Each structure stands twice: as C-alpha cells, then as structure tokens.
Symmetry: D2
Subunit: 248 residues, 4 copies
C-alpha cells in the first residue's frame, strides 16, 4: 500500500526516532499525532510540520493520558491506522560492583520497565480498541502497530540490565500480541535499532556503514513495514551489522 | 564440582519447580533456604526436608523482605553459593477482544511484570552482594544464579502477552547481568521450561516424551548448571521439543 | 542526512532463480522501478522467454549456481551487457520432503537427496556470493562508501523446520549461519549482506497451507518478497540480519 | 516420578570424532561412568591406540563420516561388539579460515574449501544420524518409551561467526537448523535429538583467545563438554534444543 491518508500516532514523537518517523510520514502524505510529554518541545515540532500534524501531550504510563491523546487523535483526524512506539528512557547502572560496594537501585529498574515496557503495552492495548473501529481494508487489515526494542534485547552490555530487560520484554510480547490481534487484522512488528544519532568511538564500532544510524533510516523501515502487508510478528535489527561488545 | 555443602536460596521454594529443586539439592547434600510468601506452606515443607532446609518468608518484590531473607540465610548457613529464581505468577488475558469489547487491564500487566521480572531482578541484585563476600574458589567462582523464564519468551500464545513480556525480560537481561558479574565470578544462567506438572490435552502436544515435564527434570538441569563451570550467559529450553501453537 | 544510495533506479541486479517465483517477482519489480536485471537460471528454464517479456533492461544468463565456470560466465555476461553489478539476489533453490527415518516403512532418507539440496541451496548461494563479491570489489564506491548489496533467501524452516524438512532446513540454516560472517568479511569493502526468511508463498514451489498463517491468513504474494528486497536495497543501514516475511506463522511439526 | 532412563551406566555410545578432543573426552567420561564407547574416526587417526587405553568397554571403528559404506561398517561393528546402540554423539569436524573475498590480496574463497567443510561437518553429521536412527529404531523402547538419543556438535559460530569463518559457520548453522526437524521426525519412535554449541575449547583444534571469555576467562576444558553430554543423556526432557557452552562469550568480528 501507500501511506498517503493514513493517520499515525507516534509516541516519543517530539524527538529522535519518533520525530524522524513523523517527518517522513507527513512528507509522504500521512497525518501524524506526536504523543509526548508536556514540555518535550512537541507543540513547536507539530507547528513546524504543518496542518497534518498535531501534538497530544501524554505520559505513556498513564491510562488517562493515553485515553485523552487517542480521543484527540479521533477528534482531529477521525481514525487511527498506525501506532509507532518510540517513547523510552535509559539508565546505565551495574547490577552489583564489588570494588565500589554499589548495588543497582530497585527504583532505577522499575522506572525503565515502566516507561519502556509497560508504557508500550499501555499504548498498544488502548490503540488496538481504536483500530478495531476501522472497517477492514480489501486485505482484512484494520491497523499496524510498530514497537521499538533495541539490539540490547539480544546482547546487552555491562550496565544495561534494566534497559535490556525492558527491551527483551518488547521482543517477547511481539508474537503473542500479533496472535491476539490477528483475528481483527492488526499487524504487530518490532524494530531493534543498533546505535543511532538522536539526542566517534561508537561510530567506529559499526561494521558497515561505519557510522551511527541516521534517524531517517529508522523512519524508512517504519514506512516499509506499513507498506508490506505480509510483515507480522517479527523483530528486525537495524544496526549496520553491529554486535555489541561487553563494554565496561 | 559437586553440590554437597553448597548453600542455595530458592525463591518459590514452597511449591512446584522450586520445591523440586530444594528436594534434589538437599538430597545431594546441599543446604536450602525456601524463600516464599507467608502462608505458602513453606514452613511445613522445610520441616519435611530436615535440618539442612529452612523457610524464609518474603515477597520477592520487597527490598526489605529479600534483605531479611538473605540475613536469615547468612545467620543459619554462613554464606550463599547459589540462587534459583522460581517465584512467579501467570495471567491469561487477551490484549483486546473485539467480539466481547474487552481490553487487557493495565494492572494485570503490571502485576505479572512486578513479580516475575522486577522480583527476579530484586533477588539477583541483593544476592550478588552476598555472593560477593565469598572467597573465590580454585576457578575464581563466587556463586551461581539460575533464573526461570519460559518458552513463552519465544512463542507466547494468545492471552500470554503479560507473561511473555515478563519472561522475555528475564531472557533479555541474562547476558548483561552475566557480563556485570563476570569480574567477580558469579555465573548467571536461565532455564526456559515448556509444560511441567506442577500446581491430557497439554501432554499430547509435547513431541517426545509426550507428557508434561516432571519437576525433578527441572531440578536435574539446575544441578547440571551448578556443576558445569563453563555454562554462563545462556538460556536453555527444557521442553520435550515443543513449539507452542498460537492457541485461542 | 548521511550520503548514501537510497534508490534502485539505475542499479544492475543479478537475480539467481530469476526465471520463476520469488526471483522473477523481484526482477519484475526492479525493472519496473528503473533498474536492470540479469536472470541467472538453468539452461532448461524459461529464463529467455521471461527476459524477453521484461524488455531491454532484462537479460537471461544461463547457469547452474553449483558450477564455478557457469557463474563466472553469467557474471561476465552481466558485465558485458550492463557494466557494473550493484546488487545480487540469491533465489535459486530446490526442496525435498523426506523423513530422516520412517520405522513403519523401514525407509531411510537417502544421502544423495541431502547432498543435492545442500549443493544447490547452500553451496550454490555461497558460490554466487564469493564470485559476485569479487566483481563488486572492483566497483568505485557510491556516495556512502558502498560497492554492493547481496540478499539471500533462507526460509522460516531454518528456525521451525517440519517433519520431512531436515535437508531443506539444514540448507537454510546454513544460509542464516553464514550471513553475519560474510557481512563481516565484506564490511571493509562496503558490501552489505542480508537474508530474507520467507514463510509460505504462492509460487510454483506451492488452501490448508493458507489457513495456518495468523494474519493475513493466506499465502504470501511473490510481489511482497520483491517489495522487501527493494526496501533492503534502499535502506543503507540494514546489514548482517535475517528478516522473516511470513504473516506471523510459526510452523507446527506436521506429518 | 515419570519412568525413564536417567543413567549412562550400561548404555552404548557411538562417538564420531572419538579419537581426539571433545569426542575423546566424551568417551573417557562415559566409559568412566559405566557406559561402553565406540570411537568412530578416520583410519589414519589414533583411534585404535585411544580405544586400547580406555579398556575393554571401548573399541575403535575406522570410518569417514562422509561415506555411507564406512558408517554402515562402523555401526555393524558396534552392534557385533556391544549389541544395542543407545547414544550417538557427533563430534567429527574440521575447520578452515578463509575470507569470502579479500580485495587487498585479490583472493577469493575457493569453492572446494567450502564444499569440504560442508561435507564433513554437515553432510557427515546427517549421514551418521540417518543410519544410527535406523539402528536405534530396532531397539525395544526403554522404561520411558525411548529408543535413542543423538547429540550433535554445532558452535557459537552458528550465531556469531567471525571474519574468515563463512564455511564453518554455514556448516554449523546447518546443524542448528536441522536439529528441530530431525527431533520432530524421530519423536514418534522415541529418539531425542539435541545439539551443543561450544565456544572456544582447549583441544588440538586450538592466551588471547582465553582472554575474550567473560567468566571463566579461559578456554573450555573438554571434560566440561563431556559433562554436558552426560547431562543431556540423563535428562529425559531435553529435546530439540541447542545449548551454548561458552563462558558467556559473544564473538567480535576479528580480522
Ligand atoms: N538512539 C538510539 O541509538 C537507540 C538505539 C536503540 C533503541 N532506541 C530506542 O528508540 C526509542 C527512541 O529513542 P530516541 O533515540 O529517539 O530518544 P529521544 O530521547 O530522542 O526521544 C525519546 C522521546 O520519548 C519521550 N518520552 C520519554 N518518556 C516518555 C513518557 N513516559 N511518555 C511519553 N513520552 C516519553 C521523550 O520526551 C522524547 O521526546 C526509544 O525506545 C529508545 O530506547 C534508541
Ligand atoms: N509449571 C510450568 O509449566 C511452568 C512452565 C514454564 C515456566 N514456569 C515458571 O516456573 C516458575 C515456577 O512455577 P511453578 O510451576 O513451580 O509454580 P508454583 O505456583 O507451583 O510455585 C510458584 C511459587 O512462587 C511463589 N510466589 C509467587 N509470588 C511470589 C512472590 N511475590 N514472592 C515470593 N514467592 C512468590 C508461590 O507462593 C509458589 O510457592 C515460575 O516462574 C513459572 O512462571 C512454570
Ligand atoms: N515459495 C515458498 O513458499 C518459499 C518459502 C521459503 C523460502 N523459499 C525459497 O525461495 C527461493 C525461491 O523459491 P521459489 O518459490 O521462487 O521457487 P521456484 O521453483 O519458483 O523458483 C526457483 C528457481 O530456482 C532455479 N534453480 C533451481 N536450481 C538451480 C540451479 N542449480 N542453478 C540455477 N537456478 C536454479 C529454478 O530453475 C527456478 O527458476 C528458494 O530458495 C526457496 O527455497 C520459498
Ligand atoms: N575445540 C573447539 O574450540 C570447538 C568449538 C566449537 C565447536 N567445535 C566442534 O567440536 C567438534 C570436535 O572438535 P575438536 O575440537 O574435538 O577437534 P579435534 O580435531 O580434536 O577432533 C575432531 C576429530 O574428528 C575427526 N574427523 C575429522 N574428519 C572426519 C571424518 N571425515 N570422518 C570421521 N572423523 C573425522 C578427526 O580425525 C578428529 O579425531 C567439531 O565438530 C568442532 O567443529 C570445537
């Protein structure tokens, strides 16, 4: 298919991979809702992108906020066809460090799980109901949901336990959610990015091309997933063939 | 090595796979601490297992409770050599069901993540500090940590999104935690069981042997991991070659 | 935005198995999008008729992928006709259905059936890779330092092979296994290496099969394989990876 | 507790590659634990001397795993000596280090090097499987319905192959790929099929290598491979799976 006329809700849409996705899709004729925190810069980004883009302030961990954002999307554009989960946070903290006597805090683990994993699920479960209102297309499809994991789901480095747990959870739930939503024609896919230039040594680690990924390359893969009706239930690494070393 | 004289803390040790693990290890001359909820039956199980087994009441989601349980283990047996994470819960709930108009609750997702994933991490981070007090053995080893994932981490069924997210998180953090703890000689391994006869159609789904797994077979694999010094950073499926169908 | 090739227009692709099925669909899409295609397929295939239908930007190169001499001949033909080769797509393949051992019948999988499937599917793919890599290595790099991109065809059988699929699954698991080391070998000279693992597609290789796919519940359309090929060529950051294209299917044992 | 075989004592194992390295370590452990071992290895190996050292419960069966006739001869020798075969362990294997293409040197991987590694490592393992499965199929089932267990040797190169490892990684990825379909083929007759993927072990196949392993930071001891073999034989519920035995290593590209 083509993305012209589709309505996309993009979490984390004020910055980075989410913003690059919004820019590409709006440039291809889609409408976009940037779902991001208050004072994320989302309003100014939506204004810059023109009248087919609006900002919906929301914390993905809040049922009430996501409900409000989806009602805003419905009032503005009439339907939701695509959801892209880019909202996320990171921490670097070792499980335990004997030399320094330091133990990872429980709260640092919980915070990253809540935003990255529970937040993605919260958006999925609520947007599925919105997509379920669509009449199926000629191929039976009502929507497409795309999540963002990380190569840390597969080769987490020293200090990445919390982040890797959160992203490994995204990977683990991709297939069951695709199976849950198959009877109503919503595809569910995940991208696992490597190292991307969002907000020299890191670049040199990538086999080829030997640079950070361009956010537009993430946006290109999102578009390819929306366009290809047979991509479902899968995780795609987008990473220049990197495999992460253990680090320190 | 042999397990005789080792001290194991076994979460979920009052029932099922954890109890089978305690029974085997105590039978092989190890000491065991059954870490499980109040009114789980843990006290009666510890009494039945004899004077090298004690019950430590604790909720794995509580820092205070796990701290208390580990201090109990230290006071009783002097050290901790092995931790086995079996504490866990389940739910069956579809992400969204159009026919019935039902959406998975946020709380059902959060509850399963908290016990299965955050609870395992809470035990890991605190037991690592305890193991760090041990003098390394002749091969540099201070401890062994074994987690329980599930084949649902890889092929979650309809209704298993929350459970699969939790277990996929266990899988995802295995390698980074092994990397974090490598400098101090604590190995970190995960078992992904298939279908086990803990608390006819399900049995017929297993290729060979065509039955539910015996909890003693999980306990045997735990012992094999403790005994083999070169198993680290890996997930082992224990499942009779099953691959789960989507279900309904 | 980092300088790179983000278009198939003007590129030249050598497509093994190009006379039929997934390879033919790929040739059709790429020629329609402004690329040139060389259909590398067996002399007894319909490749010549297919290349004529596709017009002046498509030619047939007869070759058995298991032969060093034949692949060399095909690549020299490609260079003579179109010059620079930018893309290689490995679709040449065969299948067998044969149980390892069947006690009821007292029947053992033949060694020759295993060898033949390995030779065409795995060794033939490597033969094409090693020779096209040498050709691509002579290319002046593009604006993003790239000299080529190579796309292989595995199968979901590499991950969930069914009863009777031992030989086919071995061959496609080999494809999966070598994707990363070959991407690593060729990274210093700017050749990306990627693999697609299709599920069940409506080619001459293939209702009950359609019903096992979660969504959409049908056989894949060869045009959808071709679309993913084009997406890989146009995305400069996809390298060293296997992508399942399968409607979320996970194969049960079968019989 | 479900009735099953949970001991190696009294079992007979055919071990390919048994004259050296991981296969020899496996034979040593199993014979010490009360099993009988047949070392299936090349006629120009030291298998006879090794079998003599191991005593009356170990014999040498000369054979090239790539030959149907040789493997048939070895299995008939096993049956003549010990009767029933309960276990097969595939350790026979070779390696090559050769880049797909090297632009600086103008050097291309030879087709014959790829073919030879595939033939020994992948086709040879299948040849042994298909023939020993037929032998095991004649066995009266044990107390848990089992007629055999087959254990193969892959490598972590199946998942993270390095520069120069394309051929080896293809062969070991094939082993990984066929593990599940063969387990599915043989499930109705009670033969389990499992694979071990070793990291880096101190055999005649092999300080800097030791330093890459997270913990323990050393080469694996062949005795640790043997211990995992015994654990798989003794655990009735391990089937259709690949187990990494590797100290948590994940291989970087190398050069
Ligand atoms: N950049 C990388 O190298 C990289 C690599 C792998 C994966 N990722 C993942 O990609 C996704 C996007 O990352 P990015 O690099 O674009 O980061 P970014 O920081 O540029 O953008 C993340 C956005 O998410 C928003 N956000 C954070 N918490 C939120 C919440 N609770 N509710 C709503 N919005 C929230 C932020 O305000 C921000 O605008 C994340 O999931 C990240 O983990 C990034
Ligand atoms: N039985 C199976 O088929 C199967 C399959 C795959 C994975 N698993 C996993 O194996 C592990 C053990 O399962 P089981 O079958 O033995 O279950 P079980 O119900 O018999 O035992 C689980 C134990 O965990 C305890 N527990 C629950 N929440 C706790 C908490 N917050 N703090 C401390 N203890 C807590 C329970 O009281 C109980 O004694 C779980 O992680 C489960 O998800 C089981
Ligand atoms: N169709 C499917 O459901 C499916 C699923 C997964 C993977 N695949 C794979 O996709 C690829 C394409 O399959 P298809 O469905 O298009 O099959 P197809 O039979 O339509 O096309 C395969 C082509 O390969 C050619 N070929 C065979 N042996 C050759 C050799 N030695 N040298 C040169 N060419 C040779 C054939 O002549 C034919 O034109 C194969 O690798 C196949 O294993 C197909
Ligand atoms: N040592 C390692 O670091 C390592 C790591 C991963 C995997 N492996 C694999 O483990 C297995 C055992 O390797 P090893 O380290 O013990 O090597 P090794 O060289 O010590 O032993 C291999 C044995 O296989 C035999 N063999 C070779 N070709 C044969 C043939 N055609 N027929 C019969 N026997 C043949 C050899 O004669 C030799 O005795 C191999 O499959 C190897 O690829 C080894």
């Amino acid at each position: 298919r083509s993305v012209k006329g589709l309505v996309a809700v993009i979490t984390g849409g004020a910055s980075g991979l989410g913003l690059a996705t919004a820019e590409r899709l709006v440039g291809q004729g889609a409408s976009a809702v940037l779902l991001d925190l208050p004072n994320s810069g989302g309003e100014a980004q939506a204004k810059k992108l023109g009248n087919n883009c609006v900002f919906a302030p929301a914390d993905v961990t809040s049922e009430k906020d996501v409900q409000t954002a989806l009602a805003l999307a419905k009032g503005k554009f009439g339907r939701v066809d695509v959801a892209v989960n880019c909202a996320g946070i990171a921490v670097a903290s070792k499980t335990y460090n004997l030399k320094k006597g330091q133990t990872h805090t429980l709260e640092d683990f919980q915070r990253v799980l809540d935003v990255n994993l529970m937040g993605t699920f919260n958006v999925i479960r609520l947007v599925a109901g919105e997509m379920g209102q669509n009449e199926p297309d000629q191929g039976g499809q009502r929507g497409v949901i795309i999540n963002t994991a990380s190569v840390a789901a597969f080769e987490g480095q020293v200090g990445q336990a919390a982040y890797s747990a959160s992203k490994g959870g995204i990977v683990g739930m991709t297939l069951p959610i695709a199976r849950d939503l198959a009877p109503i024609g919503i595809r569910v896919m995940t991208i696992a990015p490597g190292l991307f230039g969002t907000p020299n040594f890191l670049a040199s680690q990538v086999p080829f091309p030997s640079r950070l990924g361009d956010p537009a390359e993430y946006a290109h893969l999102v578009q390819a997933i929306i366009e290809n009706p047979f991509l479902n239930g899968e995780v795609i690494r987008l990473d220049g063939a990197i495999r992460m070393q253990p680090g320190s």
